[PDB]
Amino acid sequence: MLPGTFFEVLKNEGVVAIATQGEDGPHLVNTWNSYLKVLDGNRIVVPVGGMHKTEANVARDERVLMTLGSRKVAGRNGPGTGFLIRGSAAFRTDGPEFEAIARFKWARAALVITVVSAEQTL
Amino acid sequence: MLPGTFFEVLKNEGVVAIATQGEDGPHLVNTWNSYLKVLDGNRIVVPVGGMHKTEANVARDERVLMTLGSRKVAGRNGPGTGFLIRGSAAFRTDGPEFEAIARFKWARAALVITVVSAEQTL
Numbered sequence: 109m110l111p112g113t114f115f116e117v118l119k120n121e122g123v124v125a126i127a128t129q130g131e132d133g134p135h136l137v138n139t140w141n142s143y144l145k146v147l148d149g150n151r152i153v154v155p156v157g158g159m160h161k162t163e164a165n166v167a168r169d170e171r172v173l174m175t176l177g178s179r180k181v182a183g184r185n186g187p188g189t190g191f192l193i194r195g196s197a198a199f200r201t202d203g204p205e206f207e208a209i210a211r212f213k214w215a216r217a218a219l220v221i222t223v224v225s226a227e228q229t230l
Numbered sequence: 231m232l233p234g235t236f237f238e239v240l241k242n243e244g245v246v247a248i249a250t251q252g253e254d255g256p257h258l259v260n261t262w263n264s265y266l267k268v269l270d271g272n273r274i275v276v277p278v279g280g281m282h283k284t285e286a287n288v289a290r291d292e293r294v295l296m297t298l299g300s301r302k303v304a305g306r307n308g309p310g311t312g313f314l315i316r317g318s319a320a321f322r323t324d325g326p327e328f329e330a331i332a333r334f335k336w337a338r339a340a341l342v343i344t345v346v347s348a349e350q351t352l
């Protein structure tokens with residue numbers, strides 16, 4: 109379901125945000141557009157170095173939200189666009205989703221988000 | 231309390247993410263690094279065109295989280311850095327906080343974030 113414009117965003121660098129639900133309120137962490145790996149079957153993989161509070165949150169509520177964008181891709185009414193992605197998350201420490209990001213030697217795990225919806229919000 | 235490195239990030243374009251607490255989970259919306267105005271008092275001002283769900287969430291729980299960064303500013307271990315900002319939010323529709331973003335013709339309000347902590351997370 110990810111549209112072509114999402115793939116054009118990923119050709120450009122930028123800050124990705126990942127929100128999870130904590131018992132206390134939301135939590136928000138980041139990665140880089142250039143670190144995301146998209147796999148077949150609507151999966152986006154993030155290399156995990158820290159994300160310890162995020163991991164604790166996902167263990168109790170697997171729903172996540174993610175945003176990303178780029179001023180270098182056109183939106184509906186001028187330069188710049190981005191996406192709100194909703195999905196479910198899991199952490200993996202082995203298997204092909206882990207091997208997709210194992211080139212980052214600092215990664216202790218892979219955060220795998222299975223996308224359920226993608227909205228271009230600009 | 232906002233440090234010099236944060237102002238260096240703001241000289242570069244990027245996607246800002248703002249998380250609020252909803253009824254049924256977090257919500258996450260964006261702005262651009264180039265749209266933020268910073269006022270005396272640890273106050274960050276965001277021009278509001280939509281953010282209707284965000285505004286409903288803030289009316290119930292004023293706490294927000296914000297992230298932003300840039301690959302063009304050095305972090306602690308290599309190129310690229312960014313920040314986790316925690317603060318409290320209010321929407322303003324008159325006064326100096328609104329005037330700071332009034333040049334945006336589509337703005338309906340100013341989202342004013344009063345910063346309580348700022349962490350450089352890379």
Ligand SMILES: Cc1cc2nc3c(=O)[nH]c(=O)nc-3n(C[C@H](O)[C@H](O)[C@H](O)COP(=O)(O)O)c2cc1C
Nearest residue numbers: 137138139155156157158159160161162299312351
């Ligand atoms: C621009 C940016 C990119 C980041 N990329 C990563 C990343 O790819 N993986 C990672 O684990 N943390 C990354 N971080 C740090 C995370 O945002 C987070 O601060 C850290 O993993 C701790 O997560 P936690 O608060 O869930 O314990 C990045 C931070 C910034 C500002």
Ligand SMILES: Cc1cc2nc3c(=O)[nH]c(=O)nc-3n(C[C@H](O)[C@H](O)[C@H](O)COP(=O)(O)O)c2cc1C
Nearest residue numbers: 177190229259260261277278279280281282283284
């Ligand atoms: C990169 C980017 C920049 C955006 N900047 C703004 C902005 O400055 N102000 C705004 O109202 N919405 C902006 N949006 C749209 C918001 O993220 C959000 O989708 C919209 O305001 C609706 O908010 P709500 O879901 O809280 O109702 C931006 C979207 C993207 C992808």
